UniProtKB/Swiss-Prot annotation, chains A, B, C, D, E, F:
Residues 6-155 form the Ferritin-like diiron domain. Fe cation binds at residues 53, 56-57, 60, 63. The lineage of its organism: Eukaryota, Metazoa, Chordata, Craniata, Vertebrata. The gene is FTL. This is Ferritin light chain. It is found in: Cytoplasmic vesicle, Autophagosome; Cytoplasm; Autolysosome.
């Protein structure tokens, strides 16, 4: 409310609500990815685990944003969550390519919000993104890039065998 | 897939996917309720905690349903999640009344799915609902009814004072 | 001194000294608030504790600023500390309203210094404020807003009773 | 207030408030002394520590006096705190000479208040000063006198060397 | 590579590689300083230790920069490392003066890279420098300034004696 | 210096300084190798670790040589460090072949210095090389030869797959 709100623009407030929506949709996408890899006719437990962990992380990111919205005196507004863009996700390689595209889009939304906060001279918002989101995103994208390279190396050789080995020897399970 | 699927009708498979949607929408509603009570101009921490806990429980219920869908050889299909029906939730009394209505609707969906499983002679589905959902729902609804009675007793006396006392002396925080 | 000073403008140095003065005056104000609530004819121990804790926190903030001044090669200059603006602080509600106004003024001084550091391209100063002051201030202001809402809810109902209950059931003691 | 006040003269009440002011100004002076010795072009860590410890002790003395004021039913009144008399404090010898003069002035104020309490037949006040202040002051003044003698012995020999040795081998750090 | 690179300019990438070179050359300089003080005809173990520790710290700084380069999708390019500017480093005072000049030059390179990142709207780079380098550099420069003051105080008095005392009573060994 | 120097020829002193340069250049080469394998488009963590460990070992070898130089009364002289001979290192096989060539060159420099020490009747130097360097080098070269054989066996079969398996099942990570 007005009682606590200070140096917090309506443009940032709106953008934060949009970013919450994006994080929850990402979470929902990772839920779909995770359960696809648990299907009896896909059955890659390590890949299932990897995406289910990411679903949790994105949900937590949305919750941190909503907490911050309230701390600044903004008002959370929720919209519909669009279903994920695919019902079936292909191979481990297809899925990891989809995941990196998703993360790059989230990262771009984070960078655009930071630019907005810089333009509006809102250092608290800028620091909040820097300290909880931007470094986490860089590290996650690097990890997915490493995974992509290793999957490509393996399935170029021998696709079924390569997919199994990646799940067994790289991913946690 | 077809490899494992046995005694699992397309009607139950579809209904399970619909029930997943309902549980995720309930989770989303409880997220909204929880953060509303964390607003600086509402500020009832115990009520916030109560609804955030319920958001988690409903998400977990959806995850258990998706796990079961895969165990039976059905295919999870995700739809849009409709935003919650309100942006602001009123008093503790208004919110608890809304929550009990929501739970009764979920309970009715559980009972309707059980009836479907009984008609289709699917005992695994029937037992799964009985052992993970139906008793949990009865206990939750009883608890919310008890809370409603205590809130009504208090805010009839003295509304602001009564709301504070309920949050302090009944709800966890 | 000159031996270590690098990228540290005379304008920032002066402003830092002014900010030290403001933090020490805030500390002094909280000392007055705290001992007022310990008077035998006020006697709200939890409120006394809350303000005495804030007196300590503001003194520590001033000490951190003086440490930073020396680390950058600036010179601390001390001025008179003006007495607090009131000798008696009214009710818990009056006092919490006064405290939030004080915190908003400190927060504005922090934001103005950050803007100065940004204009002068002094990233060390900007980061120092971000990492030790700006988030702490946001969280404190949110907490005071929550307290204000709860006090207003209670004393609207029944003023004496409401004040006692807030001190007993919300504030630490 | 009047409810508890017994055998507590308006003259003692006023004097106690003046003594609070003197202790807080002493604290403020020791803060200045302490940070002066932390400057990169002075850089005597042990001397910095010694004066910062004294700043804390004098603040605590003021807090004990304010507690006693309330216990007796008097009313704390705060005045402006005058800035310290110097902006720069010279050598360790200059600073210790300044500190002993300050302590002798505080001690004289304590003795004058005790005499007032004796004249007004206020044994509680007399005992309070005897048991928390007068012996502490005697011991502190003796310690500063010992330090002065040792500094004079050293800097008479060789000023820079002597100052370093005193800081390293006598003062805590 | 291109697979992960996002919002990372070729100008920042190049500058980061130059900063790696500067940190490794600083490390190499500190190696030379450290072993000079271990010579049988210099023999100041504490000074040797101080510079060898700094050699390690600067190497670690370069490694963190190379890690970050890869995390962002840039490519590390290595150049020749120029030998240190002196073969013999004089007295403790001469060496500490040389070290502070070196640190001020590194600090200027850090500030120039931060300005570049600010101009290119690269908040991840800006925050990375703020959180791992800029505060560390300020604290190190303050420490060296303090050491310089203490060495000057001592060797002004009595050069050989003063150098020994500084090594024995200030520096770790 | 002359004060301690005994049976230590100017030819050995010079050669030791040259050997320090060679060890530091080897360290620098291994740094480059290590970070190349950490690139998102190479992404072989175990290979990165192996070369980074070797960078550390070679740096430590140089430090031991500089320590010995001082113990004998020689004077360390530092030269430029030439950048590594490649900017990109190819496959695991290419890199391990490059590493074995590098180690054989270091080993030859060690053997040539030992021969010099034997000719000059400097048993301390001869024993120092025997006890800290020559056996370590033999064991390292044997290990790299074993690795080469295993990599060749694997990538002859199936290059991408083979490289992954070697990194996962032989190298530490
Ligand atoms: Cl859609
Ligand atoms: Cl809708
Ligand atoms: Cl005034
Ligand atoms: Cl004055
Ligand atoms: Cl050169
Ligand atoms: Cl070259």
């Amino acid at each position: 409310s007005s009682q606590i709100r200070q140096n917090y623009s309506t443009e940032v407030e709106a953008a934060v609500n949009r970013l919450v929506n994006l994080y929850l949709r990402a979470s929902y996408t990772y839920l779909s990815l995770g359960f696809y890899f648990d299907r009896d006719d896909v059955a890659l437990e390590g890949v299932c685990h990897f995406f289910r962990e990411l679903a949790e992380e994105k949900r937590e990111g949305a919750e941190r944003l909503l907490k911050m919205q309230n701390q600044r005196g903004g008002r959370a507004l929720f919209q519909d969550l669009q279903k994920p863009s695919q019902d079936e996700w292909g191979t481990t390689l297809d899925a990891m390519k989809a995941a990196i595209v998703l993360e790059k889009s989230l990262n771009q939304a984070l960078l655009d919000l930071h630019a907005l906060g810089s333009a509006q001279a809102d250092p608290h918002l800028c620091d909040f993104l820097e300290s909880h989101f931007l470094d986490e995103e860089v590290k996650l994208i690097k990890k997915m890039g490493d995974h992509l390279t290793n999957i490509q190396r393996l399935v170029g050789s021998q696709a079924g065998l390569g997919e199994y080995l990646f799940e067994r020897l790289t991913l946690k399970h």
